[PDB]
Amino acid sequence: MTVIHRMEIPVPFAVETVNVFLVEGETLTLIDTGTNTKESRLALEKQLAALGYKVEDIETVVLTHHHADHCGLLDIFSERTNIVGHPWNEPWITQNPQFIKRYQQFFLEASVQFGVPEVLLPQGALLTKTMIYSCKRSLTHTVREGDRIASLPEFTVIETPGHASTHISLYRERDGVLIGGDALIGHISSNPILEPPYEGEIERAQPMLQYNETLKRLARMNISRVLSGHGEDVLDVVGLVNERLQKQEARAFKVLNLLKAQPMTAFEVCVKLFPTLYEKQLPLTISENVGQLDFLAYNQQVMIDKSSK
């Protein structure tokens, strides 16, 4: 029945490549796409051609999540193509004007709240500004926990939030294969990527706790092999999860101990945690602080505008 192929698509991010998966079944399904770049598109087209296919032959595209490396080429697919993912992808992937306005307001406010020096901010650009690597295309179909995608009958949709709010993985009960997305990556942690609140969202799960719960769920599943969004397959999910949970705990303690010595802004903690990477890249830190603020381990001296932890 199905033949699954991994295609490695170049992306202009530190991870260098994204894994996309072509499933040759009764119809042709692609899982994830690559960024909205000429380079990504050319690579996808070339690798499809070597398999004897053109973009127009793909009848279903499934998104594991809304990050640009996974959805960015959505516009290229034929008008007949089913586009399937978590429902919350929709505002991101359509670049809904109201969503974009909210996104821009959130990040401006966040920059101030976290005390990011203006010189480091995307500002103009960065060899790259923002949102520019994403698509402008709607879903045709939404999926949630336990759902089946018509073109992938042996798989079940599992909600795997944490890395992103829109994150899903595809589980094949027959042989325990998971098309994981970015929920569990072998070589690097895939910790929560900060997002704006959705319109109407009063609250979301504590993101780090959600990520950890997703990890624990995966560890309890009977998974033989994770086909990951980046890097090599994961064959020992239990082992990897245990390691990641241990590392997360250590980092949380490191943050807690940093703050005991000197109360700090998020940016200041970031510079302590990532003394080399903070100029080249910008993550996390807030995830750890927010995790500790939940769990009532750390207080925020709100007042100034630049929050003090």
Q: Return residues touching Zn ion (CB under 5 A).
A: 67, 69, 182, 229
Q: Would you say 13 or 53 has its CB closer to Zn ion? A: 13
C-beta nearest to Zn ion: residue: 67
Q: Which of Zn ion, Mg ion, none does residue 183 bind (CB under 5 to 8 Å by kind)?
A: Mg ion
User: Rounded CA gap, 172 and 175, in Å?
Assistant: 6
In the list 31, 32, 83, 137, the residue contacting Mg ion (rule: CB under 5 A) is 137
**What is the radius of gyration, based on Cα positions, of the chain?**
20
Q: Which of Mg ion, Zn ion, none does residue 182 bind (CB under 5 to 8 Å by kind)?
A: Zn ion
Helices 286-293 and 207-220 cross at an angle (nearest 10°) of 90
Q: Would you say 65 or 309 has its CB closer to Zn ion? A: 65
Which stretches of 138-193 are assigned E, i.e. beta strand? Answer: 141-142, 155-159, 168-172, 177-181
Q: Which of Zn ion, Mg ion, none does residue 295 bind (CB under 5 to 8 Å by kind)?
A: none
Ranges within 74-93 binding Mg ion (CB under 5 A): 75, 82, 85-86, 90-91, 93
Q: Are 86 and 168 in contact (CB under 8 A)?
A: yes
Q: Which of Mg ion, Zn ion, none does residue 6 bind (CB under 5 to 8 Å by kind)?
A: Mg ion
Name which of 164, 179, 154 is nearest 86 in CA terms: 164
In the complex, the smallest distance separating the C-beta of residue 65 from Zn ion, rounded to whole angstroms, is: 6
The total of other beta-carbon atoms located within 10 Å of residue 145's CB is 11
Amino acid letter for position 71: C
- Kindly state whether residue 34 participates in binding Mg ion, applying the rule CB under 5 A: no
Strand arrangement of the beta sheet that strand 177-181 belongs to: 155-159, 168-172, 177-181, 225-228
In the complex, the smallest distance separating the C-beta of residue 110 from Mg ion, rounded to whole angstroms, is: 9
In the list 4, 13, 111, 195, the residue contacting Mg ion (rule: CB under 5 A) is 195
- Kindly state whether residue 198 participates in binding Mg ion, applying the rule CB under 5 A: yes
Ranges within 215-254 binding Mg ion (CB under 5 A): 215-217, 221, 223, 228, 231-237, 244, 253
Task: State the pairing for strand pair 17-24/3-10.
Answer: antiparallel
Q: Would you say 69 or 288 has its CB closer to Zn ion? A: 69
Q: How many residues bind Mg ion (CB under 5 A)?
A: 101
- Kindly state whether residue 33 participates in binding Mg ion, applying the rule CB under 5 A: no
Q: Would you say 115 or 162 has its CB closer to Zn ion? A: 162
The total of other beta-carbon atoms located within 10 Å of residue 87's CB is 12
Can you tell me whether residue 31 is helix, strand or coil? Answer: strand
Q: Are 229 and 32 in contact (CB under 8 A)?
A: yes
Helix-then-strand count for the chain, H and E: 9, 10
In the complex, the smallest distance separating the C-beta of residue 52 from Zn ion, rounded to whole angstroms, is: 27
C-alpha atoms less than 13 angstroms from C-alpha of 300 in its C-beta half-sphere: 17
- Kindly state whether residue 134 participates in binding Mg ion, applying the rule CB under 5 A: yes
In the complex, the smallest distance separating the C-beta of residue 304 from Zn ion, rounded to whole angstroms, is: 32
In the complex, the smallest distance separating the C-beta of residue 119 from Zn ion, rounded to whole angstroms, is: 27
- Kindly state whether residue 263 participates in binding Mg ion, applying the rule CB under 5 A: no
Q: Which of Zn ion, Mg ion, none does residue 21 bind (CB under 5 to 8 Å by kind)?
A: none
- Kindly state whether residue 39 participates in binding Mg ion, applying the rule CB under 5 A: no
- Give the list of residues 6+ apart from residue 47 with CB closer than 8 angstroms, or none: 7, 9
